[PDB]
Amino acid sequence: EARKVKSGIRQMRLFSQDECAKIEARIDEVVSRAEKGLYNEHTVDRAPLRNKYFFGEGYTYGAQLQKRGPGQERLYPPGDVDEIPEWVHQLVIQKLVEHRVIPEGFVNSAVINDYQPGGCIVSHVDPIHIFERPIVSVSFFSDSALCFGCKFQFKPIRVSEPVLSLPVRRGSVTVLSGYAADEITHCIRPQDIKERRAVIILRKTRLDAPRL
RNA sequence: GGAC
Ligand SMILES: [Mn+2]
């Protein structure tokens, strides 16, 4: 299963320090605008140590699901979340298309996940009924790891030993497909977030993805 | 400090 996950992982260094510093400033400006109430309601998802910023297409998850279950996550109504920022197209998405990571016109969803030290996201599969593959992630502000096949326990939070631990370094691009994207959860453990880390996740929603 |  660890070997199976490996076949679906593409990881490469793509962004330089100056490019990360420019984007990390754009991330800091996204956080500032969200704190000023200048984004649409569903653009900003707030949790104690993690903030999610949905552009282009957002999704419901977790406790926002009244009926929890496989296939229950939903996209928001059309045109609800804010459009992908121009700086995301030029700085992040044009670099990925020019380096053949994804086709042009693939990405219609750009989500920025912002983690404070000790933050996490519990094990999950990116909803197969919502998102097409592959899943592209670009990390910022610090180095961390992406873990697979972890079982979470709570009160207090405990995370089982990962099937695979993948270091995700600042400026590196992580791509998930196949088994690593479909047949096993991925997560972030609190111990792996030692400083603030942000990741811009570029995805393609399916033509049949249900909306709220 | 909680997406399976
Ligand atoms: Mn995910």
Residue numbers in the entry: 81 to 292
Please quote the authors directly.
AlkB homologue 5 (ALKBH5) is a ferrous iron and 2-oxoglutarate dependent oxygenase that demethylates RNA N6-methyladenosine (m6A), a post-transcriptional RNA modification with an emerging set of regulatory roles. The results support a mechanism involving formation of an m6A hemiaminal intermediate, followed by efficient ALKBH5 catalyzed demethylation, enabled by a proton shuttle network involving Lys132 and Tyr139.
We modified the construct to produce N-terminally truncated ALKBH574–292 (residues 74–292); we were able to co-purify ALKBH574–292 in complex with Mn (substituting for Fe) and the m6A-containing 8-mer ssRNA substrate (U−3G−2G−1(m6A)0C+1U+2G+3C+4). Clear electron density is present for four (G−2G−1(m6A)0C+1) of the eight nucleotides of the ssRNA at the ALKBH5 active site region in all three copies in the asymmetric unit and the observable ssRNA does not appear to be involved in crystal contacts. Interestingly, in this initial substrate complex structure the ALKBH5 active site did not contain the cosubstrate 2OG analogue NOG, although NOG had been added to the sample mixture prior to purification by size exclusion chromatography. At the ALKBH5 active site in the structures reported here, a catalytically inert Mn ion (substituting for catalytically active Fe(II)) is coordinated by the highly conserved metal binding triad His204, Asp206, and His266, a water molecule, and either 2OG, NOG, or a sulfate ion. In the structure of the ALKBH574–292–RNA complex without 2OG or NOG, a sulfate ion (likely derived from the crystallization buffer) was observed to ligate to the Mn ion at the 2OG cosubstrate C-1 carboxylate binding site via one of its oxygens; the sulfate ion is also positioned to interact with Asn193 and Lys132.
